[model samples]
Target: IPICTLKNFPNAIEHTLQWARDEFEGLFKQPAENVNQYLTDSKFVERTLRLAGTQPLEVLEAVQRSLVLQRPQTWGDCVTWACHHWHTQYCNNIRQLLHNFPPDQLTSSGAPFWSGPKRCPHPLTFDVNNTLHLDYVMAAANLFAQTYGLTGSQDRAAVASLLQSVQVPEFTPKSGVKIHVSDQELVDDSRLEELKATLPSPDKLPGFKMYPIDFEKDDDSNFHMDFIVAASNLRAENYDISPADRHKSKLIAGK
Candidate 1:
């Protein structure tokens, strides 16, 4: 037997159903309504409860049984279960109601995939590990070169020299264990004081600067070749210039 046509028929049942249908229509139709009036009335709520109860037992009875079975559910659990079971039905009904509706017909320009407020017009891309490695190498090379007054080529060679000078300490990891750092520290503690003495202090060299010449900026458009020549010249002349100052000077030259 149809649940709607069941034995129990409250006098307000038909009116409640009509009210619910009207409320659903009103939601899609109008923008202005009192917040209190937007809610399903007690009569409509009763009819909904009756309709939901058609699954097996009355809505109230099912709830009572769930509670008495030592499985007294929290409001959250009840709401979650109700949503899980009936959300699809509600969504479908709402969609049907709004079908061919003018407001619902509007489409928005696609949103950017990036999390930031500024969006890229072109397709954004990234090379995670490679980009990081390149940056590290470039930064290290630039740092060492600028510190020692090395030309661009010399700077690269200095980086290579530093890399070759590195002595990796012996490390023995247990099976299935991943090793992050070397067992031995990178710097030699025995010559720590001597090395510290040899290092140049920023304060001591008041006017000293590290000029990082971008090879790309050269007339040849090849950073490596230009950098090497520039690095060699800087090393020969013992030139000390800050990267920022060098960049500024270049901008003034219109190069």
Candidate 2:
């Protein structure tokens, strides 16, 4: 069957797997690399779709059996397994089409086409326990699938569901005396200042923005009480220095 004919089919697994192996793997990998790379490429997607396609019937049955339980390694891995094969095919196809078009005609503004990384940076960083970024992977997959006329509402929904299932790790500090300090404290630190000096200028950064905050509103309120208390507590516990004379130390020693 043609790749597009697999949509909503009863045997989506057989269809999808065959398409991935034949169309994507077959088309992309060369005869030399095929022996080594083909199975690796197919394994992840094969496992995921096998589970998804058979979930209504076999997954629950398998779960009960305990004889054959299918568990995905990581949530991101599961999603990658489900989508990457077809998605990459779609992205490559679009890239080919763009290559066929004249560079000037590809963009309305006549600017060079953006060949940078695809997908939103925030989601890329925040998703999947922050161990691996899957946004670009998912984006590439969806793009490739769409370009080949293989993606549909269900495919998009499946990708979205995978994204939603990925749990974001929170940036929580461990047990410690929480201390808030003034911007001046950061500015005065020689190491921090030296590191800041080494960084590229704001204009050199890809995208940079500055916002002014009105600190006069509550700069010296009881909000600073927590900062003072924490600073005092930390100093007392960690170092013999008093909070009032913390400025005497050129650098606070790390515990």
Candidate 3:
């Protein structure tokens, strides 16, 4: 089903939606038909839960903490930024792997690939480490996660935990986040002054800019390039094989 935006008329009921249409008529405004569907639909003892596939999580973990300059306002912009990342952010980083498959490696647009019918190898293994470059897709996914209060693809906790998690985003003045004042925390820390007293003086601060020691280049940065290339090509490859062989391609290619 095509992704649809939540509109006032609930026009796209014909298409499947994760968010119910009744949400617009009742949730924030007054109740519709003297009853809120969001509440009534939940049922007195009804439970509606969804299971997310691990494929997205894997992609998320691979692009954790990815910071890009652009911010996407809609799904169209999001997809545009994703493709832009594939070309710009994901370039140079992938070209290095061309040695493994000489004569033909990168796609016309710089999507990493090898000269083979299958996109990813039978083993389907590479690296999955770092991506500190000017990445836009990572930035977009991270932005989506942040907007929805997700712990990002990095958090893999499941089933049990005492300290429950909440899907609330943190806003700050430095970030210039325009959320409502009530929608943010202004930090009412009890020991804030005490902590401030222990801080090093600005005069003692280094003259040069510095980042985290853990943020360094690694082989895993290429994992995303490999995965994207393999996934894309596998989905688009015209394997000149029998129909029987084509059926087997669906397992890994999933096209």
Best by lDDT: 2
Give me the displacement of residue 102 in model 2, in angstroms.
Answer: 4.8
Better of 1 and 2 by lDDT: 2
Q: Over all chains combined, what TM-score does candidate 3 have?
A: 0.21
lDDT for each candidate structure: 0.28, 0.29, 0.27
lDDT of 3: 0.27
Q: How should the candidates be ordered by TM-score, best one leading?
A: 3, 2, 1
lDDT of 3 by residue, 41-68 (tens): 4331112112133332322222121221
Q: How close is every model to the real structure, measured as TM-score?
A: 0.17, 0.19, 0.21
Cα RMSD, each candidate: 34.6, 30.3, 23.2
Question: Which residue pairs of candidate 2 clash?
Answer: 87-141, 90-144, 90-145, 91-144
The alpha-carbon lDDT assigned to residue 207 of candidate 2 equals 31
lDDT of 1 by residue, 73-129 (tens): 232232222222222222332233233222223335553322232111111111213
Of 2 and 3, which scores higher on TM-score?
3
Which candidate number would show the highest TM-score if scored against the true structure?
Answer: 3
Give candidate 2's whole-model lDDT.
0.29
| Lowest lDDT 10-residue stretch of candidate 3 | 208-217
